[PDB]
Design a protein around this ligand. Structure first.
Ligand SMILES: Nc1ncnc2c1ncn2[C@@H]1O[C@H](COP(=O)(O)OP(=O)(O)O)[C@@H](O)[C@H]1O
Ligand SMILES: [Mg+2]
Lengths: 670, 62
């Protein structure tokens, strides 16, 4: 057992010069009679099982077959933290129920919902989407049963869903809600729901051999690629490899590197099937990961944390675990959120090692030493409510009537410095009155399927007297910002030079790409010529269509049309008006140029010496053109990899645009 | 000296005011709301766990 410790490069490599029958084998099917009796007795139930027991797929099917839906009058809501896990598992259940997708089994995520009103029986949703359902219906009267799945992940939207549903259970006696999670300590969930009974599904798992490095690795990515090959060449099929990578940017760099080596190996090495899994994965790619691999082929799955708990790939025999999770961390004193990658806790690494033990005895490979596991790793994960901005959450709770906000029962309370900074952010955005009541702007911000800061940009373009009449340009740029990592094939500067010769900032470039694509009658041939992914732009047009319908219900489109007649915009004046709208929407994300470098303006934030990320076009202009750096820069994303980086950078040429748009911040700062 | 704001535990307001930001400051707003309620690292590129130009990673030999 002590032989587990291994060395990388173990020795380089040479190159010549019935679907119904499978449902009964799941472990939840043998406990089906006992579990449905327990749901009838108890209003709330915690169901624990090993990952892959069948609880996400079979439990909604068991409720419909029993009769909880009541002939299709009452819908069943199933709550997912992951967006990919909502869409892909709903496709599986539609195959098992034999219905076509979106008619009797549908999904609802924020920009696409495949649901029909009368026919849909069970619906799979993102955890954020069921929160938005409270604004329309406070009692959730259309749902007979709600299932909060993956509750051990402890996301932000799950925590408020547990808090909001706690209030409604005395009001509704016929609503049954099921908490389903991995085999984690559910005593904390059971205490919250007044001594709730817990059901445990025993899982059949095989022992996994867990391997550690002798020394820590300089590059885990190179160590993970080498570990794939020493499994691929020296082991016997069938065995599939599951690799846990942090983000979609590292997955695609690993995939093209791993494809490059297999081209050099050629005929001698066996065929490798590389399937990526990440957050904004397209729908056609999600079918590829669940396909059974052909004979004489090895599947190598490159995945984020979605494959850890949310979904299982059948046939995994090898797991490679570097041990990092990319996450969003919010600090209340500084007041900003960062994208940073951290070593994950001991409980999550043990959850990743269990994936090799499903179909048989497997091997788990860890790129970190055993000494960097006993002492260097935390024991449990910190919940998301401990590090989140909470500005969108408090605005949603004030809309629902949660006035007290500190006696509102939660499993983990938010801290007072986080809750204070969340209230100050809504007051800056104008969503909250000085008397404290929610204003007409704040009720408007809850209507949009976006963050309240993006809803402020769309409000400013239609209404504000210096900015009035650029709503059509702002609906384009906000829609491009949701799909920014998937826009470009190859390097961004080559596609940027083709669409427009000189662009100042990223927001104006994203406007120019969508306009020239629209002028070409939405041609697929335009995107290949200018090196933009065509499948991404179809999603961007879907986002713009959904935001345009929400702007009509608010009334911003009618106020836009009256404004465009009066002003008579000139193309020099348009980019100035677009800049001022994003200043009012994102006033905290302004960076001042200093002697050492770019630096955060906020006096609570202080001086961070942030640098411009190399993918942004603002970095491309400074390296190639002789233009001096701009004094003020607005960013959409902040990222920490060895120094702080800003993405989606906007250029603010004028100092007085800060003071004119948001004087409540920048009167003191300037 | 320290003002208290109690929320309306239950007609439109278009803009906030150009003067309510002066009557109630931004930093004073969050403190005043809580009194009414009651209350009053760096990780370089692909670096491994526990460790401390591109040279293209080909672990393949002729
Ligand atoms: N989209 C899909 N395509 C094919 N098979 C799937 C899909 N989703 C789930 N499965 C299979 O259904 C089974 C049930 O898994 P699931 O219910 O998601 O796990 P858990 O019990 O952890 O929620 C798994 O063995 C998995 O292989
Ligand atoms: Mg599941």
């Amino acid at each position: 057992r002590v032989k587990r410790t291994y060395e990388v490069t173990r020795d380089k490599y040479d190159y010549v010069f019935t679907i119904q029958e499978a449902r009964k084998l799941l472990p939840v099917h043998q406990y089906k009679d006992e579990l449905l009796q327990e749901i009838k007795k108890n209003q709330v139930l915690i169901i624990m099982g090993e990952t892959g027991s069948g609880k996400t797929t079979q439990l909604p099917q068991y409720l419909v077959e029993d009769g909880f839906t009541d002939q299709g009058k009452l819908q069943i809501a199933i709550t997912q933290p992951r967006r990919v896990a909502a869409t892909s598992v709903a496709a599986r259940v539609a195959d098992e129920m034999n219905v076509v997708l979106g008619k009797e089994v549908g999904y609802q995520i924020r920009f696409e919902d495949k649901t029909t009103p009368n026919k849909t029986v069970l619906k799979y949703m993102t955890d954020g989407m069921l929160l938005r359902e409270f604004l329309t219906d406070s009692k959730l009267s259309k749902y007979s049963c709600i299932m909060i799945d993956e509750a051990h992940e402890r996301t932000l939207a799950t925590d408020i869903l547990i808090g909001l549903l706690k209030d409604i259970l005395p009001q509704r006696p016929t609503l049954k809600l099921l908490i389903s999670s991995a085999t984690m300590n559910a005593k904390k969930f059971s205490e919250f729901f007044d001594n709730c009974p817990i059901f445990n599904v025993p899982g059949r798992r095989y022992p996994v051999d867990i391997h550690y490095t002798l020394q820590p690795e300089a590059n885990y990515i190179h160590a993970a690629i080498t570990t794939i090959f020493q499994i691929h060449t020296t082991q016997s099929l069938p065995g599939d490899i599951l690799v846990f990578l942090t983000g979609q940017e590292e997955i695609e760099r690993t995939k093209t590197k791993l494809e490059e080596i297999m081209s050099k190996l050629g005929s001698r090495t066996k065929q490798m099937i590389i399937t990526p899994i990440y957050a904004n994965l397209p729908q056609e790619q999600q079918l590829k990961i669940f396909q059974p691999t052909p004979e004489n082929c090895r599947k190598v799955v490159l995945a984020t944390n979605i494959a850890e708990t949310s979904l299982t790939i059948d046939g995994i025999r090898y797991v490679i675990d570097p041990g990092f999770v990319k996450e969003n961390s919010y600090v209340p004193s500084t007041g900003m959120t960062q994208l940073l990658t951290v070593p994950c806790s001991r409980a999550s690494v043990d959850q990743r090692a269990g994936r090799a033990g499903r179909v048989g005895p497997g091997k788990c490979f860890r790129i970190f030493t055993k000494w960097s596991y006993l002492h260097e790793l935390e024991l449990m994960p910190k919940p998301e409510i401990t590090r989140t901005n909470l500005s969108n959450t408090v605005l949603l709770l004030l809309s629902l009537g949660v006035t007290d906000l500190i006696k509102f029962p939660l499993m983990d309370k938010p801290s007072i410095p986080t809750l204070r900074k969340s209230l100050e952010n809504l007051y800056i955005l104008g969503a909250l009155n000085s008397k404290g009541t929610i204003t007409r702007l704040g009720k408007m911000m809850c209507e949009f399927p976006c963050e309240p800061e993006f809803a402020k940009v769309l409000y400013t373009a239609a209404t504000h007297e210096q900015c009035q009449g650029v709503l059509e340009e702002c609906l384009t740029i906000v829609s491009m910002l949701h799909e920014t990592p998937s826009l470009f094939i190859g390097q961004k500067r080559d596609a940027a030079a083709s669409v427009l010769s000189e662009v100042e900032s990223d927001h104006i470039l994203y406007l120019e790409i969508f306009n020239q694509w629209r002028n070409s009658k939405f041609s697929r041939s335009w995107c290949q010529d200018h090196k933009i992914q065509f499948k991404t732009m179809l999603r961007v047009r879907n986002i713009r269509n959904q935001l345009f319908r929400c702007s009509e219900k608010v009334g911003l489109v009618e106020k836009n049309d009256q404004a465009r007649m009066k002003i008579g915009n000139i193309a020099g004046y348009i980019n100035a008006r677009i800049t001022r709208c994003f200043i009012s929407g994102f006033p905290m994300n302004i960076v001042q140029l200093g002697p050492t470098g770019y630096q955060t303006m906020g006096r609570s934030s202080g001086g961070l010496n942030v640098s411009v990320h190399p993918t942004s076009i603002l970095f491309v202009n400074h390296k190639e053109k002789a233009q001096r750096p701009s004094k003020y820069v607005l960013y959409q994303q902040l990222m920490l990899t060895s120094k702080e980086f800003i993405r989606d950078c906007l250029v603010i040429p004028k100092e007085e645009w800060l003071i004119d748009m948001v004087p409540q911040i920048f009167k003191d700062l300037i | 000296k320290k003002l208290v704001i109690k929320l309306s535990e239950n007609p439109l307001v278009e803009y906030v005011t150009e003067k309510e930001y002066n009557e109630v400051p931004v930093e004073e707003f969050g403190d005043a709301l809580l009194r009414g309620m009651g209350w009053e690292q760096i990780h370089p590129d692909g670096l491994g766990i526990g460790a401390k130009e591109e040279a293209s990673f080909m672990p393949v030999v002729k």
